């Protein structure tokens, strides 16, 4: 009876309010799937297209910053406890730094298989306009899909923890498993049948757990029970702005509804004036001597008798109004521009920082709510054994995010500077025997923020080098 | 009776609505083939030509970005499972990297044989204007063809999976096989006869399958049964924008119909004024002393008696209206410009990124829906055995797309930078024996994102080099 839960957990007020926001920017992203059965039903548009362009540009731009195509978007600290991390893979105490880097480098490419990038862009659009999205990642094939709030509903506490979810989907009988298709032997046409999925949180001895099950419209279960640890669950609900106490988030467009509402009416008035500007009439002045028939029926080049100014073109003075309205609309549009950001790894650094400045602190929220689970899922896909050992014991991987994934990104810059300075300081002091070069080295290296333990040689290596002479 | 299915699967509303979009941009691309039998039937044009220029420019530009002429448009990851991939070709563990690169480099040239590029451009036009296209690739010869929704119809579930298709085509009796031409012995003229093809999805033990069959108008089958795995099917339906629940997609032009509709009327009014500006009349003022006969019939150079201002040229004041209308039309046209993008491998990178920014996230959709099957088809054409082994077992090739085919494109840039930095850091630290050069190497290389396993020498090679002394 998952239909009962699905209906119970909905919020009609938010669904009804979020129609205008879509109507002002991109109506086709928020279309109701329950009013159509495979045929077009018309969708109306608005008198202005500024919102569409702004939203398209911002959604396209956000994808490049969050998911760069030539470097990983997450880093592993590993400073917590190297013992267990090294014991899981079975490597030396120092080879962990190389192994983690190899895993991170080889893992992030998996996000570009089987059209995931397009779904990511669609999810960004959904988050910007409606502020809610559910993301499903299939490990067997490598494909993803994004859903709107018209196909799912969630339940959470006052503290924000998600407790339950239900998802609706439509299909046909031919797609069902052989076990369940023995029933419904009649009516084996391409008739549509609904399917429901439920995700529920539960706790076992070694931690919390998510349980997945499925059911048809008429109560019948379909087995397929699966259990995942909370860290590697394939379902990811996300929010843009979440007011404490509520269940669903809010979008960026909701903060700027007044300007769009004030712009649509001006656009309508401009359209009315432009349509009025298409009257082509010629007026014959009354009280003037003219020969209308000859003027209107003679071939070009003839001579006629009458005043050379007895006929004039219709004039209403509506051009100045168009000129005036255009300037006001342009001024409002320009004033709205900054809010929507309309205009080597360091380039990505600066772009992300400027996105932080423009958005106001949501880039960090998006990074926090998306980067953490995807990293675990991809790492599990690339190496099952290593993650299985970590989850069974209870401890979990540490990941850095929030414009802070520069752990292995821009350390070479801090080494180049040290090398440049060491080439200027050491040539001097070579003659003076009172200054120890080792202390200068140990001061300069630590000054720039480099852990000397990853560069200095061990005692055994020095002894071997001295012996090899 | 494939005619019944063909008629059943059509959507008349979309077909009737999509006429205006073609009429505003390029009427000849959407002409009905069932109203003509080999003779011209006139096609009407519109008062404005902005849409035609914009569509031509965008369609021409899109082809260069998607299908560059001097590098492959797809890359193979191979990180999934090198065991089976190496076992299929019969190569070593490390020679796979070279073999895959060779295959990718030698495969992509096949797209330029026998006039495929023109069909690709036509398909891009069709996608932009109507948002639907069916693409057929013939392996025997190397030619392609593109069809509009006036010649085919498709069926899909609520989830978007395509289940069935039907295609219509016209020909003559002389083209039929000898087996079927024994019938229809009479009427062996060049009379036109229709032909129908059906593509249906079905599942067998080792995966899903597509079945192709043909039939004439009068029920008679023509044999030619063929079976393809779903991955290497030669038919590819595509969409530009697909609203969940519906069957056919939507085009880019549909988002900007209001501006074009508002522009056509202004163009008509401008044409009316321009036609009015062709009245050449001379008016003889009433109440003035003049000698009209002498003025109008004497040779040039004569002297006449009369006022020097008794005759004036006709004046209606319609020039200012032309000046005004031109500015408004130009302003609207300029405002429409950005939406249609009107204005070394890195150049292609930047061009594709800017296309991503302008379009709003469709470049990725087009790449996802076109690159994946064409890669498999071309690879099968260049090497049948390798693909046959992979498909029989069940596993499939992994391909990267969505402005993410840079796997083997721009790795040399990340190596040049490392080489430049290594030439500045290693000259220093040569005197200090406390810093190990190997650790600096292993840090700098991994910092830029290079898998050291493809550069470092193995233990055996080092031993051999040491012995060779």
């Amino acid at each position: 009876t998952y239909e009962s839960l699905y209906t119970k957990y909905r919020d009609d007020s938010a669904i009804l309010k979020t129609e205008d926001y879509a109507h002002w920017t991109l109506p086709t992203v928020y279309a109701d799937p329950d009013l159509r059965e495979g045929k077009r039903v018309n969708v109306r548009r608005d008198y202005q297209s500024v919102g569409a362009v702004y939203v398209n540009t911002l959604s396209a731009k956000l994808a490049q910053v969050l998911f760069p195509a030539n470097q990983a978007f997450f880093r592993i600290d590993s400073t917590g406890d190297a013992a267990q991390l090294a014991e899981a893979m079975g490597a030396e105490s120092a080879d962990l730094a190389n192994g983690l880097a190899e895993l991170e480098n080889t893992a992030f490419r998996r996000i570009f298989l089987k059209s995931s990038y397009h779904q990511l862009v669609h999810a960004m659009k959904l988050l910007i306009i409606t502020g809610n999205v559910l993301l499903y990642r299939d490990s067997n094939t490598g494909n993803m899909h994004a859903y709107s709030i018209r196909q799912y509903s969630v339940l959470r506490d006052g503290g924000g923890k998600v407790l339950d979810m239900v998802l609706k989907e439509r299909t046909v009988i031919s797609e069902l498993p052989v076990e369940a298709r023995i029933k419904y032997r009649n009516r084996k046409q391409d008739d549509c049948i609904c399917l429901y999925t439920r995700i529920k949180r539960e706790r076992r001895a070694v931690g919390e757990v998510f349980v997945v099950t499925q059911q048809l419209e008429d109560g019948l279960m379909l087995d397929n029970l699966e259990v995942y640890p909370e860290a590697i669950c394939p379902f990811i609900p996300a929010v843009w702005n979440l007011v404490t106490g509520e269940t669903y988030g809010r979008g960026l467009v909701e903060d700027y509804a007044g300007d769009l509402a004030k712009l649509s009416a001006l656009s309508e008035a401009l359209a009315l004036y432009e349509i009025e500007a298409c009257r082509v009439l010629h007026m014959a002045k009354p009280g003037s001597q003219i020969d209308v028939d000859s003027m209107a029926e003679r071939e070009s080049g003839a001579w006629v008798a009458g005043d050379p100014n007895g006929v004039a073109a219709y004039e209403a003075g509506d051009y100045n109004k168009i000129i005036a309205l255009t300037q006001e609309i342009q001024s409002i549009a320009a004033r709205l521009a900054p809010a929507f950001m309309y205009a080597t790894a360091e380039e990505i650094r600066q772009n992300a920082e400027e996105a932080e400045l423009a958005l106001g602190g949501v880039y960090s929220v998006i990074a926090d709510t998306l980067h953490i689970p995807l990293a675990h899922i991809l790492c599990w896909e690339v190496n099952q054994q290593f993650i299985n050992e970590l989850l069974s014991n209870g401890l979990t991987l540490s990941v850095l995010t929030g414009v802070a994934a520069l752990s292995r990104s821009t350390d070479v810059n801090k080494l180049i500077q040290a090398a440049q300075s060491l080439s200027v300081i050491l040539p001097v002091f070579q003659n003076t025997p009172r200054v120890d070069p080792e202390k200068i080295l140990d001061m300069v290296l630590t000054g720039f923020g480099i852990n000397t333990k990853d560069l200095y040689r061990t005692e055994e290596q020095l002894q071997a080098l001295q012996a090899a002479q």
Side-chain angles (χ1 to χ4, degrees), chain A residues 1-2 4-36 38-74 76 78-80 82-83 85-86 88-91 93-103 105-113 115-182 184 186-188 190 192-216 218-298 300-306 308-346 348-352 354-437 439-458 461-465 467-468:
Chain A
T1 185
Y2 299 157
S4 296
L5 310 179
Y6 174 85
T7 299
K8 182 178 177 181
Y9 297 157
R10 294 175 68 87
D11 177 11
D12 291 331
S13 310
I15 292 169
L16 188 153
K17 297 297 293 295
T18 47
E19 304 220 343
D20 290 309
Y21 310 152
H23 160 88
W24 284 324
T25 56
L26 291 175
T28 58
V29 171
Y30 194 66
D32 195 347
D34 279 306
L35 282 72
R36 55 197 71 233
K39 307 259 166 179
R40 293 179 67 254
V41 64
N42 55 7
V43 174
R44 187 171 177 85
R45 256 96 182 170
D46 195 37
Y47 298 97
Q48 50 80 27
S49 53
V50 178
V53 177
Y54 285 179
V55 171
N56 281 320
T57 309
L58 178 58
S59 69
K61 186 183 284 186
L62 274 186
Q64 307 179 34
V65 178
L66 294 174
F67 302 111
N70 74 295
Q71 60 189 67
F73 55 84
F74 66 92
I76 307 171
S78 74
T79 60
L85 263 68
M89 294 182 286
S93 180
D95 189 66
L96 181 66
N98 183 276
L100 296 180
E102 183 178 1
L103 181 65
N105 266 330
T106 199
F108 79 96
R109 299 292 180 90
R110 296 284 294 239
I111 194 66
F112 300 105
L113 307 187
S115 86
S116 288
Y117 199 83
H118 180 36
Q119 300 297 356
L120 295 174
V121 178
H122 192 58
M124 295 296 172
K125 285 166 162 179
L126 263 177
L127 273 172
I128 290 171
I129 291 169
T130 53
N132 301 270
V133 69
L134 174 58
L135 194 67
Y136 169 84
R137 159 55 165 236
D138 178 2
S139 296
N140 298 287
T141 311
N143 212 346
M144 315 179 67
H145 202 270
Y147 305 84
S148 77
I149 60 172
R150 288 214 184 242
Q151 283 150 286
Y152 83 98
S153 68
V154 309
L155 182 148
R156 64 176 68 237
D157 288 332
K161 291 177 71 68
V162 174
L163 299 190
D164 207 27
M165 302 187 274
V166 171
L167 167 60
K168 190 204 278 197
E169 183 178 1
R170 271 214 307 145
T171 189
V172 291
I173 298 172
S174 66
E175 301 287 274
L176 299 202
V178 184
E179 293 82 3
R181 185 177 65 246
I182 67 192
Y184 311 82
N186 61 6
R187 294 179 64 253
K188 197 168 293 310
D190 296 315
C192 295
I193 62 170
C194 302
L195 184 70
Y196 287 88
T197 306
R198 182 179 180 180
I199 310 101
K200 183 174 175 65
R201 164 172 281 123
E202 290 208 83
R203 65 179 64 88
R204 283 85 170 93
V206 291
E208 293 179 353
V209 162
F210 268 109
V211 182
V212 175
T213 57
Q214 296 197 307
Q215 188 177 186
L216 281 167
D218 54 29
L220 177 76
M221 294 299 291
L222 314 179
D223 197 344
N224 313 331
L225 183 63
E226 293 179 353
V227 186
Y228 309 109
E230 163 205 14
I232 57 173
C233 192
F235 292 84
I236 306 171
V239 285
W240 173 281
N241 182 13
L242 176 62
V243 177
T244 188
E246 304 175 337
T247 290
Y248 298 96
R250 306 198 181 214
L252 170 55
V253 171
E254 182 175 0
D255 299 354
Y256 293 91
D259 272 22
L260 301 182
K262 189 159 40 173
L263 199 70
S264 160
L266 279 160
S267 299
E268 179 182 359
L270 176 66
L272 272 180
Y273 287 163
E274 279 191 279
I275 292 299
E276 294 293 328
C278 301
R279 289 187 190 271
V280 175
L281 275 71
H282 281 273
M283 297 283 199
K285 290 174 185 156
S288 288
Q289 295 291 322
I290 46 167
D291 187 14
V292 193
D293 294 330
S294 294
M295 299 211 312
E297 297 199 288
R298 292 286 295 273
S300 49
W303 290 31
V304 179
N309 276 300
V311 171
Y314 170 80
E315 182 65 26
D318 47 356
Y319 177 53
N320 303 289
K321 290 190 178 294
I322 297 162
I323 297 297
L325 281 177
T326 297
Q327 294 178 356
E328 292 163 11
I329 287 180
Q330 205 154 1
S331 66
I332 288 173
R335 173 164 71 212
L336 263 174
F340 285 85
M341 293 177 71
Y342 199 72
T344 310
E346 304 209 71
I348 295 163
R349 157 186 304 195
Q350 292 184 353
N351 196 4
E354 194 163 12
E356 206 81 11
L357 298 171
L359 296 158
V362 179
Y363 173 88
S364 291
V365 168
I366 287 168
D368 264 16
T369 187
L370 294 174
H371 284 213
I372 306 300
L374 274 165
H376 292 84
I377 296 176
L378 300 195
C379 289
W380 185 88
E381 282 183 351
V382 176
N383 193 8
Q384 293 179 356
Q385 207 189 341
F386 175 76
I387 308 291
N388 281 0
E389 294 293 328
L390 273 164
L391 291 168
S392 292
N393 306 340
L395 73 165
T396 180
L397 284 177
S398 301
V399 164
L400 289 72
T401 55
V403 64
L406 314 178
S407 297
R408 276 71 174 175
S409 304
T410 79
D411 302 4
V412 65
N413 303 101
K414 274 198 307 273
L415 191 62
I416 290 166
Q417 274 175 3
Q420 287 177 341
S421 297
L422 279 196
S423 66
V424 170
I425 307 167
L426 282 72
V428 181
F429 303 126
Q430 171 141 39
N431 290 318
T432 47
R434 186 268 186 189
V435 168
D436 295 330
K439 295 177 175 63
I440 291 161
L441 198 61
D442 186 74
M443 182 179 72
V444 174
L445 289 177
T446 61
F448 277 108
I450 297 156
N451 296 115
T452 55
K453 182 64 69 177
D454 311 324
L455 308 172
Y456 286 14
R457 276 181 186 155
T458 45
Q461 298 187 231
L462 294 174
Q463 293 294 305
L465 184 64

